[PDB]
Amino acid sequence: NIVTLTRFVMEQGRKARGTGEMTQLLNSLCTAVKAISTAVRKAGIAHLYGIAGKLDVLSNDLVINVLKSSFATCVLVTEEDKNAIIVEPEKRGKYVVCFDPLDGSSNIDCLVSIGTIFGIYRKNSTDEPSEKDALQPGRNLVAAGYALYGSATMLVLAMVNGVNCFMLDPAIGEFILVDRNVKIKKKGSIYSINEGYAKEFDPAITEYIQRKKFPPDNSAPYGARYVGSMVADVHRTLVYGGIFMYPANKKSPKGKLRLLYECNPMAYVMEKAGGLATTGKEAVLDIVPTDIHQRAPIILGSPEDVTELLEIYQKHA
Amino acid sequence: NIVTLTRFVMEQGRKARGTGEMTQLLNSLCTAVKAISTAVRKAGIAHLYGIAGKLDVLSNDLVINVLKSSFATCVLVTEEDKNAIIVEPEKRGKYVVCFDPLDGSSNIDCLVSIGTIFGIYRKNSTDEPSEKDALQPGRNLVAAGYALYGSATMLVLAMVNGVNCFMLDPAIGEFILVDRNVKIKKKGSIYSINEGYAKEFDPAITEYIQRKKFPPDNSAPYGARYVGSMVADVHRTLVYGGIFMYPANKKSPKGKLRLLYECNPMAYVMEKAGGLATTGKEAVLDIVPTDIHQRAPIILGSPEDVTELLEIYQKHA
Amino acid sequence: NIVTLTRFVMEQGRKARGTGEMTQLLNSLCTAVKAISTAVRKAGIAHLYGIAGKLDVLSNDLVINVLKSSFATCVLVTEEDKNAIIVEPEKRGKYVVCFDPLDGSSNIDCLVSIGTIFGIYRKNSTDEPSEKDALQPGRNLVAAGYALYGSATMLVLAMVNGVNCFMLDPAIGEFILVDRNVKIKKKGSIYSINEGYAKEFDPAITEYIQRKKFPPDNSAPYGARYVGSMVADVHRTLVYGGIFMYPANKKSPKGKLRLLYECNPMAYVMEKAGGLATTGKEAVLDIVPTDIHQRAPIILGSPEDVTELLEIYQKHA
Amino acid sequence: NIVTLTRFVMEQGRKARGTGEMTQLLNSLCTAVKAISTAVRKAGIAHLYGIAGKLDVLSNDLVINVLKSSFATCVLVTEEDKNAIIVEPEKRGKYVVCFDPLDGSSNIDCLVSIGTIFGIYRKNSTDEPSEKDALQPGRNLVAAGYALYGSATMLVLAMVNGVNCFMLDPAIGEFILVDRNVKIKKKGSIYSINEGYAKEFDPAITEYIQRKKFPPDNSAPYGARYVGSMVADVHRTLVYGGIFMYPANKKSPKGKLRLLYECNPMAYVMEKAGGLATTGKEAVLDIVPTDIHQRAPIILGSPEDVTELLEIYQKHA
Ligand SMILES: Nc1ncnc2c1ncn2[C@@H]1O[C@H](COP(=O)(O)O)[C@@H](O)[C@H]1O
Ligand SMILES: Nc1ncnc2c1ncn2[C@@H]1O[C@H](COP(=O)(O)O)[C@@H](O)[C@H]1O
Ligand SMILES: Nc1ncnc2c1ncn2[C@@H]1O[C@H](COP(=O)(O)O)[C@@H](O)[C@H]1O
Ligand SMILES: Nc1ncnc2c1ncn2[C@@H]1O[C@H](COP(=O)(O)O)[C@@H](O)[C@H]1O
Ligand SMILES: O=P(O)(O)OC[C@@H]1O[C@H](COP(=O)(O)O)[C@@H](O)[C@@H]1O
Ligand SMILES: O=P(O)(O)OC[C@@H]1O[C@H](COP(=O)(O)O)[C@@H](O)[C@@H]1O
Ligand SMILES: O=P(O)(O)OC[C@@H]1O[C@H](COP(=O)(O)O)[C@@H](O)[C@@H]1O
Ligand SMILES: O=P(O)(O)OC[C@@H]1O[C@H](COP(=O)(O)O)[C@@H](O)[C@@H]1O
Ligand SMILES: [Mn+2]
Ligand SMILES: [Mn+2]
Ligand SMILES: [Mn+2]
Ligand SMILES: [Mn+2]
Ligand SMILES: [Mn+2]
Ligand SMILES: [Mn+2]
Ligand SMILES: [Mn+2]
Ligand SMILES: [Mn+2]
Numbered sequence A, B, C, D: 001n002i003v004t005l006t007r008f009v010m011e012q013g014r015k016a017r018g019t020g021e022m023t024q025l026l027n028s029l030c031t032a033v034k035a036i037s038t039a040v041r042k043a044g045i046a047h048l049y050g051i052a053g054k055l056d057v058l059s060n061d062l063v064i065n066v067l068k069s070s071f072a073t074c075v076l077v078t079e080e081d082k083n084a085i086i087v088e089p090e091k092r093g094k095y096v097v098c099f100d101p102l103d104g105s106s107n108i109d110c111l112v113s114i115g116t117i118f119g120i121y122r123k124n125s126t127d128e129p130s131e132k133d134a135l136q137p138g139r140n141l142v143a144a145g146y147a148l149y150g151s152a153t154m155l156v157l158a159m160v161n162g163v164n165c166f167m168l169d170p171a172i173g174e175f176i177l178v179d180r181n182v183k184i185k186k187k188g189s190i191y192s193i194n195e196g197y198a199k200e201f202d203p204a205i206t207e208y209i210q211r212k213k214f215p216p217d218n219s220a221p222y223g224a225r226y227v228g229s230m231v232a233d234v235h236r237t238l239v240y241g242g243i244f245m246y247p248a249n250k251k252s253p254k255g256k257l258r259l260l261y262e263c264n265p266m267a268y269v270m271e272k273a274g275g276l277a278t279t280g281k282e283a284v285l286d287i288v289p290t291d292i293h294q295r296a297p298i299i300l301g302s303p304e305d306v307t308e309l310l311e312i313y314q315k316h317a
Helices: A005-015 A023-038 A056-066 A105-110 A193-199 A203-213 A230-240 A259-272 A303-315 B005-015 B020-039 B057-068 B103-111 B195-201 B203-213 B230-240 B261-271 B304-316 C005-013 C022-042 C054-069 C105-110 C195-200 C203-213 C228-238 C258-272 C304-316 D004-013 D022-040 D055-068 D107-111 D195-200 D203-213 D232-239 D259-272 D301-313
Strands: A071-080 A090-105 A114-122 A141-148 A151-159 A163-171 A174-179 A191-192 A244-248 A276-278 A298-301 B072-080 B097-104 B114-123 B143-149 B151-157 B162-168 B175-178 B191-193 B243-246 B276-278 B298-301 C073-080 C095-103 C114-122 C140-149 C154-161 C162-169 C174-179 C191-193 C245-246 C276-277 C298-301 D074-080 D092-103 D114-122 D143-149 D155-158 D162-169 D174-179 D190-192 D243-246 D276-278 D298-299
Touching: A005 A163, A005 A174, A005 C022, A023 A056, A023 A090, A023 A114, A023 A141, A023 A151, A023 A163, A023 C005, A023 C154, A056 A071, A056 A090, A071 A259, A071 D022, A105 B230, A105 D162, A114 A230, A114 A259, A114 D143, A141 A230, A141 A259, A141 C304, A151 A230, A151 A259, A163 A259, A191 A203, A191 D074, A193 A203, A193 B203, A193 D276, A203 A303, A203 B195, A230 A244, A230 A259, A230 A298, A230 B103, A244 A303, A259 A276, A259 A298, A276 A303, A298 A303, B005 B020, B005 B151, B005 B162, B005 B175, B005 D022, B005 D301, B020 B057, B020 B114, B020 B143, B020 B151, B020 B162, B020 D004, B057 B072, B057 B097, B057 C105, B072 B261, B097 B261, B097 C154, B103 B114, B114 B261, B143 B230, B143 B261, B151 B230, B151 B243, B151 B261, B162 B261, B162 B298, B162 C073, B175 D259, B191 B203, B191 B230, B195 B203, B195 C114, B195 D092, B203 B304, B230 B243, B230 B261, B230 B298, B243 B304, B261 B298, B298 B304, B298 C073, C005 C022, C005 C154, C005 C162, C005 C174, C005 D107, C022 C054, C022 C095, C022 C140, C022 C154, C022 C162, C022 D114, C054 C073, C054 C095, C054 C105, C054 D155, C073 D155, C105 C114, C105 C298, C114 C228, C114 C258, C140 C228, C140 C258, C140 D298, C154 C228, C154 C258, C162 D276, C191 C228, C191 D232, C195 D203, C203 C276, C203 C304, C203 D195, C228 C245, C228 C258, C228 C298, C228 D107, C228 D162, C258 C276, C258 C298, C258 D195, C276 C304, C298 C304, D004 D022, D004 D155, D004 D174, D022 D055, D022 D092, D022 D114, D022 D143, D022 D155, D022 D162, D055 D074, D055 D092, D055 D107, D074 D259, D092 D259, D107 D298, D143 D232, D143 D259, D155 D232, D155 D259, D190 D232, D195 D203, D232 D298, D243 D301, D259 D276, D259 D298, D276 D301
Parallel strands: A071 A090, A191 A244, B072 B097, B191 B243, C073 C095, C191 C245, D074 D092, D190 D243
Antiparallel strands: A090 A114, A114 A141, A141 A151, A151 A163, A163 A174, A244 A298, A276 A298, B097 B114, B114 B143, B143 B151, B151 B162, B162 B175, B243 B298, B276 B298, C095 C114, C114 C140, C140 C154, C154 C162, C162 C174, C245 C298, C276 C298, D092 D114, D114 D143, D143 D155, D155 D162, D162 D174, D243 D298, D276 D298
């Protein structure tokens, strides 16, 4: 009585009486992620080193061809491509897929955890697909999730029904459901932010950080953690509780994280897990995108920690 | 032409005119690390999940068994064991090995990078082997290094002639030399410390951090990173540059990090790479331990960043 | 534009407007075969050998639990169980599955190729499932096939539409379609039989063998091949052409190979591939089984080679 | 406690007081075999099938490159190369290696067991290294063995002190000693020969086969097996007992099997295991080659079965 991703996706496609198109899509994603995982852990590297006489780019190509080979997509948006990819009408399905094929690429030389992030929208409208089809607020997401290539490979999938975590068994190449209907803690004890940007923080963030290090009610201070790869930082937030933040600063008054393929999927996982995701002023899932590579400030995590900071944001409002 | 860890170790052992006792020890280590890597990556997990027919305890058991069978060790010191382990006379060799089988174990549920740390001493006072044989300053290390299980598995080996990084190709189970004679940048641009302890930092540390966030000469502040796993943080330092800190505070008046199997091996690596590793008052390698599970304050990284901090310490002295 | 077993099975389930039950079944089989393949190639053997301090039986259990976990089966027949396994009504589906979890087990110590063989029937009737549900002639098979664990792992799947071959990529744990709509050669140049039973052969087999070694029309003689594992011998027959035979002798006047889980699936693959499978008197697929472990003589392969021998069988009739 | 090929080789090399030159050669071989095994098992095939972003030539290239880099060889002899390969003086060592990189290559499309065969000689006449250095009788082998890629990968190594089998654990890329000091049964019960050449067999062979099918003393006839891959057939002989035959016929008046890299290594293995290996007229190891691609008749296996056949030869002499 074990549950594999392949079994789960099919039973769910059956319960929802789908035509099987989304199921074929989710299966192609599962296959793409296993292929990326393998290249990340460097299997075959000996060949590059002459035993017999890129990564971001390879990841992009894998995700694109595998997704197109699903016959379930019409518009693809990648962090790696300036323009949205419109699918050939022969393989054109009804899904729009926004993804970051390998987030944290600059961490690669340091062997820090990296991941793949994706959000799926159903093409709403009836005209020649285009970038406009991806410009939907995150509230319209059919599914969203990410794959984390850390000490082990994990796929976290969020859909209307909830959040589920699947661990990859690289021996048989199968994702096994290990955490079902996940819920984030109401209050965590870790905060995550790049404090090297201190001089740039708005007063509300500055005050919050101060409350965490020197608690006014004399409670224990929060521990700090900042891996430097969103997928790793968010996954730790989801599993262990706490708050993650990447607010605005000189690096764009608009934030650094991209709305469509970084913030939205994460905000979606967070909300389905019972947490919050806000820009400080509004909920991330409610922002109407105007540009496929639009950035946005984001704060996510345990609801009590996010509301606490939202209050400070009010006090300074 | 390609260089595997197996060939390199043997070659070095040949140039050193060794009896091949250390070579066997190093081959054993390599075998232990590949085994731990496989377990960490979760191969075979489908079995726990009943496709019908603890990770730090297994790691401990693997290291101890694999090292004993090398017939090259007489005294073992593990983070996991209260007392030193004395090898049976039948299996005795002349080496003392101090290791942390799986560091960052708390981080396991969050899939954060973890690693194995080891330091190798040669038994000097030839009395019956005992705990006192491990009580040697790090300046007496013959070899030290670590294995990091991150996006990929890497083994860094440092010996008197320098530091070398080997990447694991899991397809053929062989470590390939990917970086020769490593040297750390003179000055970095990332500082790594758990700022959650700000309330308890000594003055020098407090001044240094603030200097990194608000540099006097209005230059770019240092970026910040803190994975919360020493091997991961120390490996990013060695490779990318910067400074790593785990100073003395209240919950740990002498630091959290253990001297024999965490601070020494890492300080040795740092020093052979041209970096510094201090306690704030003194070099970590010169400290003569008195207890095998002794703790010690540690600051390591690019020579200029560490020097700058040490000047500040002297200033408050 | 690559085709994985998972994609293929789903598109075919869609074309046939299935409810998705057979598809879930085929997916469970694919997963069982990858798990068996891994144990066959001995991954993890170091643990049996004490690195940190059956096969036929393990294969049976994997296939049974994985199949039951599909919720698509009601009656399971295994070469390893005296009695047919009736599925719990909770997980009871509509399919009857006959399989040999690991054929050629006595070859294991010699590392000869071995495999898994399976035939699927739709439960015809409407009463409490039982052994009687498996007692159908092979002509009623919905699907049949085998997995060969040889130099590489291959899954050959035969359905009403034809025969397809999928090679396993153990790096990503995915079967890739490599040979589509396979057809056996009309005439081969290799014959396969255990000639150690010469003294026991009926006159027709004896004459045929004689024609192959000393051709009366002076054509080149046929080469001989006899691996000793049916799956290996049949797979070579399917791919390279020729004839395979295991007629009756003192080892049962009834043959050695079992009808339900060895002969039928193979006869089915053969026929779908355009070849023949006969007992010498009748077509194997047409025999009405009377006992789940019933044996039967079998001759299969290229149609011209099988008809040639059938003629000799007539001459001696 | 467990024994890996790496430890065993080093230990043996220590007991022999070698300079570690042969040890490096043997470590190189091991690395080459693991690499070939991975390629044979088809890892990464999904790439040829365009998940978008010859096996005997690659094997040849792997062996040659990996052996050259060992700095232990001066002359290489491959089944795949017309002339011997002379290693650059910069990389010269004292050993001559004769190998078949991938034997049974015809069998690849049929997924039949294949293997690698090697024999190691020490350069004696110290003139400029040349082809003549490989022209040594097998009685002069320092080491020989083979790697079989069957249901699992095994490496059999024979040296003056005996024959040892190592099983590859692909999870950690390590060969584990699974069988120590192997010895073949005195008498077997399987004979292995391509009976398709019956029309061309000499009288002795013809009598022997018939004696196996119809034993005078009405005892059980020998079972027959003929995989068609020497390593597979010879490995079943060593492990299970019996006799393997590839006599002289018409299409091959001196046999098909080559002396230097097929017959010698296998005869050496057989002899250290307590078996016999003859040409019919003489022991294979005593033959002094005159051409590097020379062919030779071979009969090997249990000492009693081979003797019996040799008596029959003498009878027709
Ligand atoms: N595997 C599945 N899991 C959960 N919901 C599904 C699945 N397949 C389809 N659905 C749902 O049913 C809708 C239509 O399915 P489809 O016909 O495949 O496009 C989807 O957009 C989801 O809302
Ligand atoms: N593989 C090696 N790599 C580097 N140094 C070595 C190696 N083998 C031996 N040496 C050195 O030679 C000394 C004696 O080696 P041993 O006789 O094997 O105990 C060691 O303690 C090292 O200092
Ligand atoms: N994956 C599939 N491939 C080919 N035929 C299928 C598939 N699924 C179902 N069918 C066919 O449709 C019938 C009923 O499907 P099902 O509703 O799943 O039981 C099967 O028995 C086959 O005859
Ligand atoms: N690893 C080993 N295993 C068995 N015998 C060895 C080993 N190493 C060296 N010897 C033997 O010692 C001789 C010289 O070794 P070498 O100096 O390395 O060239 C060889 O030719 C073998 O006869
Ligand atoms: O390189 P990417 O693909 O844009 O992602 C890097 C991002 O960079 C953030 C960290 O940025 P700072 O270095 O500015 O903190 C992470 O949280 C995200 O992973
Ligand atoms: O779980 P361990 O073996 O004690 O290791 C955790 C150690 O803990 C340090 C961080 O601890 P803090 O949470 O106190 O910062 C790391 O740098 C070391 O990896
Ligand atoms: O051991 P199993 O599972 O019954 O299968 C062995 C069978 O045995 C046949 C060979 O039998 P002989 O040794 O009698 O030739 C093969 O063709 C089949 O694989
Ligand atoms: O393809 P190769 O390298 O020539 O090897 C085939 C050889 O051929 C022999 C069998 O050949 P026949 O078909 O003539 O029996 C085997 O025993 C050897 O493995
Ligand atoms: Mn990216
Ligand atoms: Mn990104
Ligand atoms: Mn530990
Ligand atoms: Mn530790
Ligand atoms: Mn069986
Ligand atoms: Mn069987
Ligand atoms: Mn060859
Ligand atoms: Mn050959």
